[PDB]
Design an enzyme around this catalytic site. Structure first.
Site, PDB file in Angstrom:
ATOM      1  N   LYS A   1       0.853  -1.180   0.000  1.00 25.64           N
ATOM      2  CA  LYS A   1       0.000   0.000   0.000  1.00 25.64           C
ATOM      3  C   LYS A   1       0.889   1.230   0.000  1.00 25.64           C
ATOM      4  O   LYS A   1       1.696   1.415   0.919  1.00 25.64           O
ATOM      5  CB  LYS A   1      -0.909  -0.008   1.237  1.00 25.64           C
TER       6      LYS A   1
ATOM      7  N   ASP B   1      -3.309   4.276  -1.713  1.00 30.28           N
ATOM      8  CA  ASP B   1      -4.159   4.673  -0.599  1.00 30.28           C
ATOM      9  C   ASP B   1      -4.318   6.179  -0.620  1.00 30.28           C
ATOM     10  O   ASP B   1      -3.626   6.892   0.103  1.00 30.28           O
ATOM     11  CB  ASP B   1      -3.540   4.229   0.721  1.00 30.28           C
TER      12      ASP B   1
ATOM     13  N   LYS C   1      -7.351   7.760  -0.317  1.00 31.04           N
ATOM     14  CA  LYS C   1      -8.585   8.129   0.388  1.00 31.04           C
ATOM     15  C   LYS C   1      -9.398   9.170  -0.370  1.00 31.04           C
ATOM     16  O   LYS C   1      -9.763  10.224   0.161  1.00 31.04           O
ATOM     17  CB  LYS C   1      -8.268   8.577   1.807  1.00 31.04           C
TER      18      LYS C   1
ATOM     19  N   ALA D   1     -11.697  11.648  -1.874  1.00 26.79           N
ATOM     20  CA  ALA D   1     -12.783  12.252  -1.098  1.00 26.79           C
ATOM     21  C   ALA D   1     -13.244  13.592  -1.661  1.00 26.79           C
ATOM     22  O   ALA D   1     -13.472  14.554  -0.919  1.00 26.79           O
ATOM     23  CB  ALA D   1     -12.362  12.399   0.367  1.00 26.79           C
TER      24      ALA D   1
ATOM     25  N   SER E   1      -9.726   3.745  11.717  1.00 30.50           N
ATOM     26  CA  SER E   1      -9.178   3.107  12.908  1.00 30.50           C
ATOM     27  C   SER E   1      -8.805   4.029  14.063  1.00 30.50           C
ATOM     28  O   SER E   1      -8.589   3.560  15.183  1.00 30.50           O
ATOM     29  CB  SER E   1      -7.937   2.302  12.523  1.00 30.50           C
TER      30      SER E   1
ATOM     31  N   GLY F   1      -4.401  -0.609  11.261  1.00 31.51           N
ATOM     32  CA  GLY F   1      -4.442  -0.368  12.690  1.00 31.51           C
ATOM     33  C   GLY F   1      -3.826  -1.490  13.499  1.00 31.51           C
ATOM     34  O   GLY F   1      -3.988  -1.530  14.718  1.00 31.51           O
TER      35      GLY F   1
ATOM     36  N   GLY G   1      -2.536  -0.647  17.919  1.00 34.68           N
ATOM     37  CA  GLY G   1      -3.029  -1.552  18.949  1.00 34.68           C
ATOM     38  C   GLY G   1      -3.777  -2.793  18.499  1.00 34.68           C
ATOM     39  O   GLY G   1      -4.049  -3.687  19.310  1.00 34.68           O
TER      40      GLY G   1
ATOM     41  N   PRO H   1      -2.930  -8.956  15.068  1.00 34.93           N
ATOM     42  CA  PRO H   1      -2.964  -9.628  13.763  1.00 34.93           C
ATOM     43  C   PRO H   1      -3.983 -10.768  13.694  1.00 34.93           C
ATOM     44  O   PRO H   1      -4.862 -10.742  12.838  1.00 34.93           O
ATOM     45  CB  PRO H   1      -1.536 -10.167  13.601  1.00 34.93           C
TER      46      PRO H   1
ATOM     47  N   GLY I   1       2.081  -1.050   8.925  1.00 38.07           N
ATOM     48  CA  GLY I   1       3.085  -0.055   8.576  1.00 38.07           C
ATOM     49  C   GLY I   1       4.238  -0.006   9.567  1.00 38.07           C
ATOM     50  O   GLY I   1       5.192  -0.771   9.449  1.00 38.07           O
TER      51      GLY I   1
HETATM   52  O1  BMP Z   1      -8.678   3.667   9.076  1.00 41.83           O
HETATM   53  C1  BMP Z   1      -7.547   3.676   8.574  1.00 41.83           C
HETATM   54  C2  BMP Z   1      -7.359   3.668   7.181  1.00 41.83           C
HETATM   55  C3  BMP Z   1      -6.070   3.665   6.706  1.00 41.83           C
HETATM   56  O2  BMP Z   1      -5.830   3.633   5.395  1.00 41.83           O
HETATM   57  N1  BMP Z   1      -4.989   3.705   7.557  1.00 41.83           N
HETATM   58  C4  BMP Z   1      -3.645   3.689   6.944  1.00 41.83           C
HETATM   59  O3  BMP Z   1      -3.045   2.447   7.264  1.00 41.83           O
HETATM   60  C5  BMP Z   1      -1.661   2.644   7.634  1.00 41.83           C
HETATM   61  C6  BMP Z   1      -1.458   2.236   9.063  1.00 41.83           C
HETATM   62  O4  BMP Z   1      -0.071   2.260   9.378  1.00 41.83           O
HETATM   63  P1  BMP Z   1       0.477   1.819  10.805  1.00 41.83           P
HETATM   64  O5  BMP Z   1       0.569   0.241  10.829  1.00 41.83           O
HETATM   65  O6  BMP Z   1       1.914   2.500  10.828  1.00 41.83           O
HETATM   66  O7  BMP Z   1      -0.410   2.331  11.878  1.00 41.83           O
HETATM   67  C7  BMP Z   1      -1.336   4.095   7.339  1.00 41.83           C
HETATM   68  O8  BMP Z   1      -0.871   4.213   5.998  1.00 41.83           O
HETATM   69  C8  BMP Z   1      -2.690   4.783   7.454  1.00 41.83           C
HETATM   70  O9  BMP Z   1      -2.776   5.966   6.685  1.00 41.83           O
HETATM   71  C9  BMP Z   1      -5.202   3.684   8.887  1.00 41.83           C
HETATM   72  O10 BMP Z   1      -4.265   3.682   9.676  1.00 41.83           O
HETATM   73  N2  BMP Z   1      -6.460   3.678   9.381  1.00 41.83           N
END
Ligand code: BMP
Ligand code: BMP
EC number: 4.1.1.23
Lengths: 220, 218
Positions: free
Chosen positions: A36, A64, A66, A68, A121, A175, A180, A183, A196
């Site tokens: 992503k 990604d 979003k 809008a 999230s 998320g 938090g 998996p 991420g």
């Molecule tokens: O609800 C959402 C939707 C997302 O795309 N994201 C995206 O998913 C990724 C989450 O990354 P991380 O595992 O570092 O928290 C980021 O790229 C964020 O923009 C998110 O965290 N929550």
């Protein structure tokens, strides 16, 4: 008939330096075939970064973005994004059905895919998005959306979103790790988890990815 | 923010040559350009610096920022690094996501515009019912710059009521989407105009015409 995501694990590559982003992605390539790419990297390094990832790794790319905006602008964004080689694009549902339909129409014409972001999230998602999310999902189903995004951080909400879209729909969930989410728990409902920082900020991103995969080995 | 002729050009052409040519053709009429993803994703973020080099105009980056706080911060950093003066952020994703943008804007000497209600028909489904509360959230957060819809002047007027006369309000949906320039300026400080100018046979005449129609408001 959904994308076949290796190890049910999608890398959220949000590093903003081209060299670091390429290094880390290359290091985890044996574990992940789906990446992503969002605006942190694209706004820093250009849309050609999609090209470079394809050249270097032969990974699927989910943009990604979003999306809008109004329908007309959404159309243009999708066209530019698919032109650059993205396999799929993520679109917000909260701007309504016409805005989503605009993206679906371009995706259909261009042979690519739309993912619909339902609930988010982060804590702020509770203010406005959460109350609209079931209806956004139902709207997606009515529009023929097949791919969805929902939050790892709220298992109860992720479960409900899965119910609304049905077992045949494809669901990915961010998320996990830093925010938090767990998996294994998340994979009860999502087809794949998005990760991420837990990977890309690790001293050894490959070991971090391998560790996540080991923890969900019985779900593969 | 002092916008020449109360008119902001929405430069959504996706070719660098056309975008620069058309902007040049109307340069005498504006000093503020809104650049969005259609142009940026087609030509790169370097287009912002190029506009500042050629026209000196202020640049509002219309990126509809709508991510989690961490990602919003990164987007704002990349955007202001490219030389944008301001960025447009969605309010729908909530207060923490807006605050992330405000923090970066303060650090880099820029402005955040909070998008409340949108102008297109789909805005009625989810955004409209949240829009007054989104505006109050902006007030609570100390937001001073807002975006609301030309296509619903009663909603634009309500947004003005919520934010007060001291706040700055810009409004798209004028022309192509049906909004009227003069009516919109009853409530907004400035109008955003895209296609009515940049798809016109003669963009300069289109701009001049709009300005003629609101001359008593300048
Ligand atoms: O609800 C959402 C939707 C997302 O795309 N994201 C995206 O998913 C990724 C989450 O990354 P991380 O595992 O570092 O928290 C980021 O790229 C964020 O923009 C998110 O965290 N929550
Ligand atoms: O509610 C909104 C918010 C916007 O930023 N916009 C933006 O304002 C511009 C309107 O352009 P036009 O005058 O061609 O309709 C577009 O760039 C669009 O993305 C909008 O139309 N409605």
């Amino acid at each position: 008939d959904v994308m076949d995501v290796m190890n049910r694990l999608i890398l959220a590559m949000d590093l903003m330096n081209r060299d670091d982003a390429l290094r880390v992605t290359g290091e985890v390539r044996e574990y992940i075939d789906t990446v992503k790419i969002g605006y942190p990297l694209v706004l820093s390094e250009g849309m050609d970064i999609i090209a470079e990832f394809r050249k270097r790794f032969g990974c699927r790319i989910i943009a990604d973005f979003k999306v809008a905006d109004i329908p007309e602008t959404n159309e243009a964004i999708c066209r530019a994004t698919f032109k650059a080689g993205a396999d799929a694009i993520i679109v917000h549902g909260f701007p309504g059905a016409d805005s989503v339909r605009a993206c679906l129409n371009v995706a259909e014409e261009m042979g690519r895919e739309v993912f619909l972001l339902t609930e988010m999230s982060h804590p702020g998602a509770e203010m406005f998005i959460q109350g609209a999310a079931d209806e956004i999902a139902r709207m997606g189903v009515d529009l023929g959306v097949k791919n969805y995004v929902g939050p790892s951080t709220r298992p109860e909400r992720l479960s409900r979103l899965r119910e609304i879209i049905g077992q045949d729909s494809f669901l990915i969930s961010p998320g996990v790790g830093a925010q938090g989410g767990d998996p294994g728990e998340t994979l009860r409902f999502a087809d794949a988890i998005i990760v991420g920082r837990s990977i890309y900020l690790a001293d050894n991103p490959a070991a971090a990815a391998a560790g996540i995969i080991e923890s969900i080995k019985d779900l593969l």
